[PDB]
Ligand SMILES: CC(C)=CCc1c(O)ccc(-c2coc3cc(O)cc(O)c3c2=O)c1O
Ligand SMILES: CC(C)=CCc1c(O)ccc(-c2coc3cc(O)cc(O)c3c2=O)c1O
Ligand SMILES: [Mg+2]
């Protein structure tokens with residue numbers, strides 16, 4: 001079983017990794033084994049003098065703080081977003097663009113970006129007067145919480161994977177991670193996409209053909225959109241993965257809708273199991289959210305993402321054909 | 324003693340209220356007695372159907388969560404910002420609904436609650452629990468909001484129990500928008516927007532919520548930075564208090580080997596030069612813009628600010 005797991009982890013650089021199989025083969029430790037594999041692939045333990053036992057202890061603790069009883073926003077989603085960000089970071093149009101610290105920030109942000117997610121939306125937490133929404137003044141409630149947990153767990157015994165970074169490196173990494181995870185708030189999607197469109201329309205490339213990013217605002221904006229694309233990448237994956245992600249998010253959404261209905265609240269979009277069209281919802285999700293984002297990402301890195309975009313468009317056509 | 328306190332509160336509508344005397348005469352309850360007076364002066368208990376006992380219970384609880392061992396950011400500052408906002412809201416030239424007035428006054432009352440007497444940058448650079456919770460972003464102001472709202476859930480403390488569901492949602496949003504705007508790192512952006520509004524000012528007039536909340540943000544920020552515009556005897560007491568708080572923070576930064584924050588190094592301080600710099604660079608640019616917005620209602624306030632700057636300069 002460990003032999004089979006190792007073989008599957010050889011696909012870590014590939015879009016369409018069998019992430020559900022890795023979750024089973026690893027004993028429900030996909031985030032740990034995929035993060036460890038990616039850290040070895042990018043030589044990050046050596047570069048940042050991360051002790052391997054510290055990395056594993058932190059990863060196992062972080063993975064524990066994802067909820068195993070939440071169908072979608074769990075450790076498998078986290079591992080998937082990590083691995084997708086890892087592939088997006090390797091795209092030819094970004095070669096040598098980001099520093100090792102920025103690469104570390106983007107992967108770490110992906111790993112923590114949904115930790116301790118309760119399986120209900122920001123708006124649900126706000127409208128139910130939740131302790132989380134009270135703590136965070138109704139503002140990026142979940143995302144502030146994911147950050148606070150992800151950073152707090154570094155203080156647990158033998159968990160500070162950043163123990164050998166300089167103070168300035170720790171300070172910079174912390175700021176970048178915060179900027180990245182806060183941008184995964186779905187209420188920010190339209191503004192993030194608008195700014196990404198502006199960057200594509202005005203983009204510049206070096207003599208070597210890679211994206212020219214010469215200030216923090218532009219660099220962090222690319223990393224924000226990269227992780228947001230990774231978070232919204234399920235419809236760009238091979239259909240058998242996409243359908244499993246859709247089954248999971250619909251379970252989570254329907255359970256939220258059941259709580260909304262019981263409370264006499266308006267039921268959130270896609271959360272009403274008695275008035276649901278999952279197929280129509282997917283076509284609309286792709287048409288209005290996912291394809292506008294991924295088409296713009298594909299333009300930024302053209303032609304690197306053409307196959308991802310082709311898969312997204314095929315999946316849209318497939319779902320449309322079931323209507 | 325309880326008879327002198329009543330006469331002091333008769334000037335609740337005046338710039339330069341004797342808030343330190345009121346703090347003393349009320350047994351260190353200036354926030355509770357001044358908020359009550361202002362709510363009674365504005366028949367807010369009747370307009371929003373607030374039980375008097377519920378108001379007093381909340382107010383005492385809120386006042387209790389200001390720290391008595393913090394020389395500046397305590398319940399006297401809270402009472403003073405409340406009362407200053409109350410006066411600025413009565414500016415003839417101002418147009419806000421009664422829910423907007425309520426949000427501005429409530430926001431003023433809670434805007435520094437549970438302040439530990441150190442700055443956001445201090446909390447960030449020391450890896451505090453507060454900065455860990457709030458991801459280094461408006462750390463104090465997010466905390467003040469969360470405490471102020473949480474206290475409404477204590478027994479007999481929900482002063483908004485008789486607002487409609489929509490009113491509570493609207494009030495909550497405005498209070499958050501206002502208190503977050505009191506973060507001093509946002510001063511330049513806030514002032515830039517106040518200037519833009521002044522250049523486009525229409526009067527008989529703020530038609531969109533964006534403009535109105537910006538005025539309320541700048542109004543409470545003005546009230547928060549109103550000490551140098553008060554009568555000199557008041558301003559000097561506020562200066563003595565914040566210098567004590569700053570110097571205690573700078574002692575902690577020195578001991579930790581951190582860079583000492585501006586005005587916090589007691590061994591290289593010039594309180595007087597700091598006051599002229601504070602007025603020239605922060606307070607007077609802000610108040611000159613506010614006075615342009617409300618022309619000419621703020622003339623006496625700006626006059627006092629300019630007199631106080633002249634006096635501090637003469638002490639150098
Ligand atoms: C308001 C609105 C229309 C949507 C905003 C919104 C959220 O706030 C949160 C999560 C999603 C989402 C995420 O991952 C999916 C994966 C699938 O495989 C299928 C899916 O449908 C989805 C989703 O919907 C979402 O779309
Ligand atoms: C420079 C800047 C943009 C912000 C720095 C900054 C803070 O962060 C926080 C509080 C103050 C401040 C407040 O109330 C005062 C009252 C006085 O009577 C005398 C005073 O000196 C001050 C102050 O200094 C401040 O200036
Ligand atoms: Mg999320």
Ligand SMILES: [Mg+2]
Pocket residue numbers: 434435463505506
């Ligand atoms: Mg404050």
Ligand SMILES: [Zn+2]
Pocket residue numbers: 077081113114231
């Ligand atoms: Zn996510």
Ligand SMILES: [Zn+2]
Pocket residue numbers: 400404434435547
């Ligand atoms: Zn204040």
